[PDB]
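for the recovery benchmark. tokens below, seq after
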């Protein structure tokens, strides 16, 4: 499958694409305002994620730091990034189907739209001003709005026992972005697409 990643923000982001143990395609690239980066992701990819990183500094070897979503200081991510990160999530060609969603389970940094460019499913979007509205205890100094699990590390927020309910904090993400996962056992907002669909991820789809 091919994914077009478009930076519509007025500021530069550093896109990243990983499946946790490996980079997807190059794994990461700078996107200036307006830039598109086209990547190819192998069919059958399970547990792939795409996110934006903000305020990054890399040297000439692709080593440095980002204020949100840093993946151990590399330009080209192999691992997932540090919260807060709004996440495009996908599993491709799972019994003839592609599954996509957007998740606020690891917090929110940049608004995002995740849409198919081929036929036969709708996209999903989280474009509200979550950083502006973020409750005070969740505000990350780096920029961004943390999830309650990252900040408090309780069973309840992290659903570590597999039973957990919505909370004051997850309710805030869900109120602003009803189409994004707001906690681990949220009612699924996954979208089912035909196997081998293609996609576009747009950062700042509105701005």
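predicted aa per position
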């Amino acid at each position: 499958a091919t994914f077009e990643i478009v930076n519509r923000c007025s500021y530069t982001v550093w896109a990243a694409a990983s499946k946790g143990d490996a980079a997807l395609d190059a794994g990461g690239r700078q996107l200036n305002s307006g830039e598109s980066w086209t990547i190819n992701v192998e069919p059958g990819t399970n547990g792939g994620k795409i996110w934006a990183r903000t305020d990054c500094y890399f040297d000439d070897s692709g080593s440095g730091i980002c204020k949100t979503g840093d993946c151990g200081g590399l330009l080209r991510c192999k691992r997932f990034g540090r919260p807060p990160t709004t996440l495009a999530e996908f599993s491709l060609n799972q019994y003839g189907k592609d599954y996509i969603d957007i998740s606020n389970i690891k917090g929110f940094n940049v608004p995002m739209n995740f849409s198919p460019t081929t036929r036969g499913c709708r996209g999903v979007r989280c474009a509200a001003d979550i950083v502006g509205q973020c409750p005070a205890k969740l505000k990350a100094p780096g920029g961004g709005c943390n999830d309650a699990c990252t900040v408090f590390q309780t069973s309840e927020y992290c659903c570590t026992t597999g039973k957990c309910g919505p909370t004051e904090y997850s309710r805030f993400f869900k109120r602003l972005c009803p189409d994004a996962f707001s906690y681990v056992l949220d009612k699924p907002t996954t979208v089912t697409c035909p196997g081998s669909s293609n996609y576009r991820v747009t950062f700042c789809p509105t701005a």
